[model samples]
Target: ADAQATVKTAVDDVLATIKGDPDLRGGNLQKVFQLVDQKIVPRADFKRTTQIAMGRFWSQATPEQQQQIQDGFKSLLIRTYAGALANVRNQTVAYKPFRAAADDTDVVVRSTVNNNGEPVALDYRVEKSPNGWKVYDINISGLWLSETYKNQFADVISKRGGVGGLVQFLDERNAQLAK
Candidate 1:
């Protein structure tokens, strides 16, 4: 359960940092992004996330396309996480204790964010990494964040053209979000 404990500690750290922090107000999206990049991304297996997310289309993609998709997905997550933090107000995260097999390679930690209205379930899928435990996917209200993108990618490829089309779609999304 080392991974679970590690994830719990990290989550606690993030929550503690944000609780009543005056700096968290205003447009502190970049600060939240920095925290995720420093504390979260290091543990995530980006290649694995991309592979699972891309699904059937993964095999069809060229090496370059695969790389593009992976990078695009990472950027997409950065934007999404930052946006969520930007809109957060009077929110608190409650952790559900996790139990895992000693030999388990992957595990999911469940929690909920009470955002002054409704409690949103957030499930973190974690994996053991060389550095430590890293979260690669989050299930929010029964929706797998990574899986959502995978399905979205599949739809774009199926309708527009192929992996290229999906990549273009992701690129467009990133561009729009940038502005």
Candidate 2:
């Protein structure tokens, strides 16, 4: 039930998986995507991530549109994460102090992943789920994942006048990333 430990475990497992698989370490995005889909997605709360990205427009979408947005956003994150997997070689993770209160339900687990001697800051915002801790947002190099996309999602929804427009935009974005 420890948030910090949960992050540490997940990171170690992912690194081990990448290290063991030559294709994953060689920047094979399709394999990386498969790895993430199986290992990372269960530990993440993409519904919450998508809600944060959608911001106020989250409530405007119907349940079906919400599911579509979630699926599209999840695919987008998989592609983004896959690109980083190639750099896992010669990497080590060092966690910062866990400052949350014992009873805290939500907390940020901060860590730095040393990539070839370059320190890259990676932090997770995890909430205590019934099953375990799940990451709803991630901060990499000071950029908040969902927050970074918030304005862009707002713009799309405003221009197209609804959540469905943003859904379409995400689909297109994911498609382009597929290239």
Candidate 3:
């Protein structure tokens, strides 16, 4: 519940910034990209997200490839997610009550971002780390975020070459997206 509140406020704050800034809605993406990389990303466990996104490919990746995938995936997600700010309209966020024990190392926070009574469900999985609670994954319309990527990566790996090929594929895609 507490973490959810923090996340809500953070999201609302970012949304407010987007709502006030015309440059962000127009052709300027650097500021929004920086906003994303700064605001929401600090609480994210990009390392863990990459590991899960890669799935079985993780075990097959070399150390350098693993690092590249982490860096590349974060850029891909941040740029894409931030770019969507161009479509941001006034919406209210409503969180479903979280049920977690005090000692639990991980928790799921679910919410709906709604506009004009329409709801789009988003859920975050956060784990307690030495630094603090960190979001590791999210669900879109309640579907596991990494789960979708993992399947796609698996298909790419099988069809492309292997784990290395999947990493390269992600690298190429991310380069194009981030461009």
Candidate 4:
């Protein structure tokens, strides 16, 4: 229940912060980026997420390329979360109670975002960290984000060349977003 409570509190804090900031309402994507960088990333196991999402490609990429991929992925996630929150017209997040042993190393907090039209199931898989509980993965609508990216990365690599191709794709996407 603590994990669920933590997630609920975090989600509420984010929502409140967004709603209270007038600048954020005016398409201030960068503000959202800052919020995520400050509040979420520190609480997310991005390194693990990157490794899992990249799969075998992780070993193939040079250290420099791996950093670039990770940075690009982080940016993509910030953009995606900001977009979702921006369009969150009358939505509610409901967290389901979770019961696990005190020594449980991993736990999942399940919730649904009722977006005024359809409810989207979201589950945050968190792990106990020295600082606190950190999110390692999320499943949206029954699709795990990390697994989805793993498949996408494989497909792109197979078609475009390999890890190099994936890096180029990430660069292009970032550039397009910048424009």
Could you give candidate 2's per-residue lDDT for residues 30-148 as a string of tens digits? Answer: 78878877778888888999999999888988999999988888888788777678667778899999999979999999999888888899999999988889989999879999988
- Write candidate 3's Cα lDDT for 1-179 as tens digits: 35666567777877787788888877476877777777778877888988998887798898988998887777777677765676676877888888877678788888898866788888888888888788888888668878888888889999998977877888788778767
* Model 1 lDDT-worst window of ten: 18-27
Task: Name the better of 2 and 4 by lDDT.
Answer: 2
Best by lDDT: 2
List the candidate 1 regions with Cα displacement exceeding 4 Å: 19-24, 88-90
Kindly report which residue stretches of model 4 are placed more than 4 angstroms away from their true locations once superposed.
none
- Candidate 2: where is the Cα deviation over 4 Å? none
lDDT for 99 (candidate 4): 71
lDDT of each: 0.78, 0.87, 0.79, 0.80
Better of 2 and 4 by TM-score: 2
Clashes of 3: 0
C-alpha RMSD of each candidate structure in angstroms: 2.5, 1.3, 2.2, 2.1
Q: Which model is ahead, 1 or 2, in terms of TM-score? A: 2
Tens digit of lDDT per residue, candidate 4, span 1-179? 35666678777777777777777766688888887776677677887788888998899999998898899888877776676766544667887678767678788888888777688898998888877888889997798899998898889889998888988888787777777
Clashes of 4: 0
Give TM per candidate. Answer: 0.82, 0.94, 0.87, 0.88
